[PDB]
Amino acid sequence: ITGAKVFAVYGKGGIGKSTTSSNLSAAFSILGKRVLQIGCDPKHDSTFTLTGSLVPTVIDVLKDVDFHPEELRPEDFVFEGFNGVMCVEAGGPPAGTGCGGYVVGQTVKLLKQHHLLDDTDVVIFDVLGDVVCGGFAAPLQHADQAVVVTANDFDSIYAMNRIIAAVQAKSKNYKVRLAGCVANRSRATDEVDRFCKETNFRRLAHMPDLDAIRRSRLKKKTLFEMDEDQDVLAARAEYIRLAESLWRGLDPIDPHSLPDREIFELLG
Amino acid sequence: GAKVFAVYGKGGIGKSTTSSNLSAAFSILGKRVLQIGCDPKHDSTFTLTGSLVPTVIDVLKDVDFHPEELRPEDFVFEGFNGVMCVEAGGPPAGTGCGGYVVGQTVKLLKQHHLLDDTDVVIFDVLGDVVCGGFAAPLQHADQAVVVTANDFDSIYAMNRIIAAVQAKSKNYKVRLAGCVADEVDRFCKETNFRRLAHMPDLDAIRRSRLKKKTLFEMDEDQDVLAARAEYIRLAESLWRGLDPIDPHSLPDREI
Numbered sequence: 001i002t003g004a005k006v007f008a009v010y011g012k013g014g015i016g017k018s019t020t021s022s023n024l025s026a027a028f029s030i031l032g033k034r035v036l037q038i039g040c041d042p043k044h045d046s047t048f049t050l051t052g053s054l055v056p057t058v059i060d061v062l063k064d065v066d067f068h069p070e071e072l073r074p075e076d077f078v079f080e081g082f083n084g085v086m087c088v089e090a091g092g093p094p095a096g097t098g099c100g101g102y103v104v105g106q107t108v109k110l111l112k113q114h115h116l117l118d119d120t121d122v123v124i125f126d127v128l129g130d131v132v133c134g135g136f137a138a139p140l141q142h143a144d145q146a147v148v149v150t151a152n153d154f155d156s157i158y159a160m161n162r163i164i165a166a167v168q169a170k171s172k173n174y175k176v177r178l179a180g181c182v183a184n185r186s187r188a189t190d191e192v193d194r195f196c197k198e199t200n201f202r203r204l205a206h207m208p209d210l211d212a213i214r215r216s217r218l219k220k221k222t223l224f225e226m227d228e229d230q231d232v233l234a235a236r237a238e239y240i241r242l243a244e245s246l247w248r249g250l251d252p253i254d255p256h257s258l259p260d261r262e263i264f265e266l267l268g
Numbered sequence: 269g270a271k272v273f274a275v276y277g278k279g280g281i282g283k284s285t286t287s288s289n290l291s292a293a294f295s296i297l298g299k300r301v302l303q304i305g306c307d308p309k310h311d312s313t314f315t316l317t318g319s320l321v322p323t324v325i326d327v328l329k330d331v332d333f334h335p336e337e338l339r340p341e342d343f344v345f346e347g348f349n350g351v352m353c354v355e356a357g358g359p360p361a362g363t364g365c366g367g368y369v370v371g372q373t374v375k376l377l378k379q380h381h382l383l384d385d386t387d388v389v390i391f392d393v394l395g396d397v398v399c400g401g402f403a404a405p406l407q408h409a410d411q412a413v414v415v416t417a418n419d420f421d422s423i424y425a426m427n428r429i430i431a432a433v434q435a436k437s438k439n440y441k442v443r444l445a446g447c448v449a450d451e452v453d454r455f456c457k458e459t460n461f462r463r464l465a466h467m468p469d470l471d472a473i474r475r476s477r478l479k480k481k482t483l484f485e486m487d488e489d490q491d492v493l494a495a496r497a498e499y500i501r502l503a504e505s506l507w508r509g510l511d512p513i514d515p516h517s518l519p520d521r522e523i
């Protein structure tokens with residue numbers, strides 16, 4: 001992918017990864033950029049808040065024409081969401097067989113087959129961070145920066161440590177660098193900060209999704225489409241700064257992943 | 269040629285706690301247990317041996333991919349009540365299929381014939397993704413026990429695990445033995461699944477003690493002995509041979 005800044009939003013599930021991913025796309029669109037969010041999570045609900053409905057996955061449409069990306073139209077797997085944010089979700093691989101790199105590989109293949117990347121200025125990959133195998137690490141081959149999503153619990157810090165090693169493994173042969181980590185919502189961050197100081201990482205922003213912003217409205221609309229109040233405007237500003245920082249570049253860092261055993265003795 | 273079960277389910281919902289106590293349950297029942305932790309976070313056998321045992325990929329890292337001079341003392345460790353257990357370890361971060369790690373941890377066991385004496389084998393497989401790589405333990409498993417909870421993510425993962433066992437059963441011997449953990453019961457009725465039991469260790473017992481040692485090794489109290497009976501009743505129920513069932517998977521839009 002060329003001619004567009006690509007960011008891979010990593011992080012494990014259950015912490016609101018799709019929330020921080022879809023709002024970053026909407027924040028880029030507020031700043032006047034053409035955004036294109038690629039949903040790579042098996043749970044194809046990353047672009048739900050952008051479109052307002054379940055977008056048909058690319059693998060669902062490809063499994064209808066017997067794997068022939070010829071009769072497919074751009075309006076069959078790419079849908080326009082809030083503020084013109086183009087939404088395409090790869091979906092999950094077949095249950096039991098098939099690889100994740102195939103679902104990610106075919107999505108980018110049709111995006112370049114129909115020339116659906118010449119107009120987009122920002123590409124947002126929402127990638128599952130629960131595993132860091134080469135199949136789900138495929139969006140790192142196209143991304144410029146990789147912002148990881150993490151929470152204060154142990155499983156998120158363990159996944160973040162696994163993504164740091166995965167991105168830096170791809171960093172030796174690809175342009176992808178680690179831009180830092182982002183707390184999922186405004187809570188305690190002492191355990192995340194201690195991991196950053198030990199790994200020479202860094203935490204970026206801190207969105208206030210915990211205070212108010214009822215989960216029913218979180219997963220329904222995006223923050224830039226909700227009605228304005230104190231908490232919405234405060235959370236909107238946290239995503240505008242994150243989008244602007246990633247746009248005009250950040251000062252590079254050189255983190256390192258702790259061994260899988262040294263992270264247990266760090267937290268517990 | 270022995271009974272083998274695959275503990276499947278999403279992470280963070282105490283799946284490793286379920287697979288560990290299930291292994292120790294078969295041990296108390298007088299069975300040779302072999303728990304193979306396939307989770308990338310190789311903490312499946314933490315409560316058994318009391319320590320983070322070296323993984324297969326970590327041994328092959330300082331062994332230069334050479335399974336020549338490898339002995340059972342390197343990767344297989346003696347756990348609680350004589351439970352042999354080995355962590356397969358996570359795939360290399362960035363590149364490397366999960367099926368390769370599962371494929372290289374079963375050949376290292378068959379190379380030494382460490383299965384001609386065991387009776388029950390427990391597979392702790394990560395259920396966050398139901399891709400073909402992580403679905404490799406389903407090929408050998410006789411049945412698969414799903415770990416879930418009342419949240420959406422655990423039910424969504426269980427719904428994809430059922431579809432993963434269905435497709436894998438068309439060419440293998442894997443079956444669906446049910447699930448363990450209100451809203452889950454509404455899922456089983458629509459999918460014709462089965463809700464086995466429910467271990468009551470969320471309250472009174474401390475997750476710190478849960479992640480420390482197995483329930484069969486803790487100090488004998490009222491709450492831990494009631495939890496031992498739940499895992500003992502589950503171990504014998506699987507050994508007796510539960511009445512098989514054919515659950516169907518739901519579309520992702522319907523789930």
Ligand code: SF4
Binds near residue numbers: 133367399402
């Ligand atoms: S590369 Fe990853 S997604 Fe693909 S089969 Fe292997 S473990 Fe599964």
Ligand SMILES: [Cl-]
Binds near residue numbers: 051052
């Ligand atoms: Cl709308």
